[PDB]
Design a protein around this ligand. Sequence first.
Ligand SMILES: [K+]
Ligand SMILES: [K+]
Ligand SMILES: [K+]
Ligand SMILES: [K+]
Ligand SMILES: [K+]
Ligand SMILES: [K+]
Ligand SMILES: [Mg+2]
Ligand SMILES: [Mg+2]
Ligand SMILES: [Mg+2]
Ligand SMILES: [Mg+2]
Ligand SMILES: [Mg+2]
Ligand SMILES: [Mg+2]
Ligand SMILES: [Mg+2]
Ligand SMILES: [Mg+2]
Ligand SMILES: [Mg+2]
Ligand SMILES: [Mg+2]
Ligand SMILES: [Mg+2]
Ligand SMILES: [Mg+2]
Ligand SMILES: [Mg+2]
Ligand SMILES: [Mg+2]
Ligand SMILES: [Mg+2]
Ligand SMILES: [Mg+2]
Ligand SMILES: [Mg+2]
Ligand SMILES: [Mg+2]
Ligand SMILES: [Mg+2]
Ligand SMILES: [Mg+2]
Ligand SMILES: [Mg+2]
Ligand SMILES: [Mg+2]
Ligand SMILES: [Mg+2]
Ligand SMILES: [Mg+2]
Ligand SMILES: [Mg+2]
Ligand SMILES: [Mg+2]
Ligand SMILES: [Mg+2]
Ligand SMILES: [Mg+2]
Ligand SMILES: [Mg+2]
Ligand SMILES: [Mg+2]
Ligand SMILES: [Mg+2]
Ligand SMILES: [Zn+2]
Lengths: 80, 24, 127, 118, 60, 98, 155
Amino acid sequence: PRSLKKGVFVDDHLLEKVLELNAKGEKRLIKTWSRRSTIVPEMVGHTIAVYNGKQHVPVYITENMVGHKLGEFAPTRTYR
Amino acid sequence: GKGDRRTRRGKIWRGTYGKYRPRK
Amino acid sequence: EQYYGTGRRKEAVARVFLRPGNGKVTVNGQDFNEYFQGLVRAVAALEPLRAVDALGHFDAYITVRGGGKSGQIDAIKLGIARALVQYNPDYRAKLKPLGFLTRDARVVERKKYGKHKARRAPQYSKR
Amino acid sequence: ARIAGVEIPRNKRVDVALTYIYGIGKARAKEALEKTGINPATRVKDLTEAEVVRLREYVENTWKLEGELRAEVAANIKRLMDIGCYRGLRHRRGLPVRGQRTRTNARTRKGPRKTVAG
Amino acid sequence: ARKALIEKAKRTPKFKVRAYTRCVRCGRARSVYRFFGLCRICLRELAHKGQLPGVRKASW
Amino acid sequence: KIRIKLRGFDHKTLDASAQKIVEAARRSGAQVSGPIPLPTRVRRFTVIRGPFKHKDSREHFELRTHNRLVDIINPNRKTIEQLMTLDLPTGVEIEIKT
Amino acid sequence: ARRRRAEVRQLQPDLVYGDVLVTAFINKIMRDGKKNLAARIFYDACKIIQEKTGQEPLKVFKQAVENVKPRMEVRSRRVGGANYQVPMEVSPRRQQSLALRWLVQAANQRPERRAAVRIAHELMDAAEGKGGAVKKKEDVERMAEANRAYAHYRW
RNA sequence: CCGGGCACUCUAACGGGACUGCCCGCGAAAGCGGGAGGAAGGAGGGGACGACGUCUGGUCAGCAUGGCCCUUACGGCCUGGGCGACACACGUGCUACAAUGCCCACUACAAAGCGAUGCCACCCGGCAACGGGGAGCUAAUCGCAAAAAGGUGGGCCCAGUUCGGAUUGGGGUCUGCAACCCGACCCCAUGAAGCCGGAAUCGCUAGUAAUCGCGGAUCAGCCAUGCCGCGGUGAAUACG
Ligand SMILES: [K+]
Ligand SMILES: [K+]
Ligand SMILES: [K+]
Ligand SMILES: [K+]
Ligand SMILES: [K+]
Ligand SMILES: [K+]
Ligand SMILES: [Mg+2]
Ligand SMILES: [Mg+2]
Ligand SMILES: [Mg+2]
Ligand SMILES: [Mg+2]
Ligand SMILES: [Mg+2]
Ligand SMILES: [Mg+2]
Ligand SMILES: [Mg+2]
Ligand SMILES: [Mg+2]
Ligand SMILES: [Mg+2]
Ligand SMILES: [Mg+2]
Ligand SMILES: [Mg+2]
Ligand SMILES: [Mg+2]
Ligand SMILES: [Mg+2]
Ligand SMILES: [Mg+2]
Ligand SMILES: [Mg+2]
Ligand SMILES: [Mg+2]
Ligand SMILES: [Mg+2]
Ligand SMILES: [Mg+2]
Ligand SMILES: [Mg+2]
Ligand SMILES: [Mg+2]
Ligand SMILES: [Mg+2]
Ligand SMILES: [Mg+2]
Ligand SMILES: [Mg+2]
Ligand SMILES: [Mg+2]
Ligand SMILES: [Mg+2]
Ligand SMILES: [Mg+2]
Ligand SMILES: [Mg+2]
Ligand SMILES: [Mg+2]
Ligand SMILES: [Mg+2]
Ligand SMILES: [Mg+2]
Ligand SMILES: [Mg+2]
Ligand SMILES: [Zn+2]
């Protein structure tokens, strides 16, 4: 039952980065400190290292992952 | 009771308005 | 011609005007039993009249504001007694033993800090 | 009578009876009796075969109900877990998914209370 | 009240939301009454000295 | 028809400095309907006594704004003579309209 | 009440029967401080006392109350290392209190669906000498005098 | 609502009033018991107010301050995470387990408070949160605003239910650069435990307890069921 609003939010740090890749190719990974950014279709197929507060986690992104934030795929806490 | 979001009293307690507690 | 009293209970005021007549009572333009009635206590308001055997002698026009309807009932009860006294002072000696002319000084007690409401203390365990 | 799958409500007000339909609460029942022009006050045993046919007609396919509903929910959770979502984890170990304190309470999600030494 | 944190006053907080009030006297963060600009402790002290005009002890 | 609103933290100062306006406007002017009290605006501040814990201490303070009315009929130009500026009061604030 | 003797509250008379005992019963029926609903219950009950019994509900009420009053009760006492159940008389005030209380409780123990019916039926049954209230009364009076041997611990 | 008028209500400044003053009885006296008159008696009710000192009580993390210690870091800036972890244990509370009740519709009575990058009447769109438009208000004059329990009418008929709303799926609104971790609110679906709670244990003596709503401080928003206030209805019992 989540919500954001009209005018969906994506941080412009990597927003231009991913399409900069898409222009000339795929390349390898990425490093992003912004987990507050929504996932958009142009990101599919890439790989994004997301900061969990400690390290960068190599999150591979698929078609069914669209719309979730990156941070959902990078759990911050270590349990048992 | 006062904990039901979908009831008049639920709205009054929660202090909000809506479909189940109109503003007239 | 006309006789007046005020009376108050629990932060409620009522202007009571006694005008000789049929005995039909009006409160805020409504009938007496329009305002009350659904309130069992209501009739008590007219107790002073029944004490001096007035009733259908005087009519009454009453303004009422403040408190809740029960306090309004008691305030009315005073006002009727006061106006009644202003009419005939000799009524006092009859009216006084019933204490209708006594104002009720009981008021909601202030909430105090550290308590829950004004008296009720927060519970504890100690273990 | 038999409406929207294998469930039969009986002998009480049609709205309240329609509540016993899986995907149907009070709102959708009110609405269904509204658009079908059936008095909600009547008992189910007093429903005309015509009325029942109309009710069934509407309710059956307007909203997704019962088994298909359950399947859809299960598929949603399964999706949540398959993608490796956080919600997926919370569903996986059976903890509150809506961001509530697990230190105390969170019992209904965690089930019965399993005590150890301290 | 750490001295670097008194960087609180900023014409450029960089965001309106990052702007938080502090006690203009002692530098307290929490319990800051907006009306006086003070915190609660300072509020009571100065109130007791009589340096807050109109402020009196309340009883009823 | 000159609207006046007198506000202050001291009921003594207000009440006393109002009757100065009234008496000044009596000789040079109309009947001067005189000060109408108006309600007080009371602002409360509740604060814990101690610097640390002890949540049950409190002792709140109040800051109250008293008001006054005036409102002289017949805005005579002869009235503004004793009126305009002659005053004792310090912590009184005055509002004026037509 | 360590200092004073704690004088008893006088209750305002009934608005109908002009009886203080009635008012007391009304108060015992009262819940969360709703007096109106209480009066509703009791008076409806009174109107149910007729067209069942031809008598006046007041009489039925007072006689029931009179039948529920315990003449003896048992209070505990600590003596020489044990706790004995000591029989002894019941002051009229406490008789009234226990009577009314028991009437209400027994009433709410009844199967009947709505309040006024419950109070009415209990009132009647107790008036003719049966029902939960009278059961309480007889149970108590049985407890005392079963303990008769301890009557010299009276105090 | 208009003219009109300070009589009443109210508002807020000053002042009167209650002192065992008067009567009976007891007493050496102070005072005690009762009665009259009185709005109120024997401290009328409630606050503020807390002695010499005690606990080497609490706080150097609100502030101040002696001593000690770090001074390319024990100082400083930022992004992100954490203070929100969960096999468990305790405290304080909230909502309940229903018919003296729950729901829907209509209708009535309050006090204290807040309001200019504010409260937001009224109109339109939206099931609604809310959005668009927009009057008034430096506010006893406009707004928050609906008070709720209550009353009248109707539905439910004793069942885990038209009780109870946790949990979860989905779709949205608002604040904010930004709601994954970790906001609140709306709508649909979901509809858990819970049938009055073991040993044990808490509050309150009168407008008190119980119960019902209302406001405020902090704050963009809010995890407020907390705190501090306000009034409505209004008990039981105290032998000792
Ligand atoms: K469970
Ligand atoms: K002993
Ligand atoms: K006093
Ligand atoms: K010390
Ligand atoms: K209980
Ligand atoms: K309740
Ligand atoms: Mg949108
Ligand atoms: Mg419910
Ligand atoms: Mg209260
Ligand atoms: Mg269903
Ligand atoms: Mg958590
Ligand atoms: Mg410092
Ligand atoms: Mg902030
Ligand atoms: Mg702050
Ligand atoms: Mg104290
Ligand atoms: Mg003694
Ligand atoms: Mg019993
Ligand atoms: Mg006058
Ligand atoms: Mg003193
Ligand atoms: Mg913390
Ligand atoms: Mg663990
Ligand atoms: Mg382990
Ligand atoms: Mg503990
Ligand atoms: Mg309005
Ligand atoms: Mg509309
Ligand atoms: Mg006006
Ligand atoms: Mg009804
Ligand atoms: Mg009914
Ligand atoms: Mg249900
Ligand atoms: Mg069960
Ligand atoms: Mg049951
Ligand atoms: Mg157990
Ligand atoms: Mg026990
Ligand atoms: Mg006491
Ligand atoms: Mg707030
Ligand atoms: Mg939360
Ligand atoms: Mg609140
Ligand atoms: Zn400070």
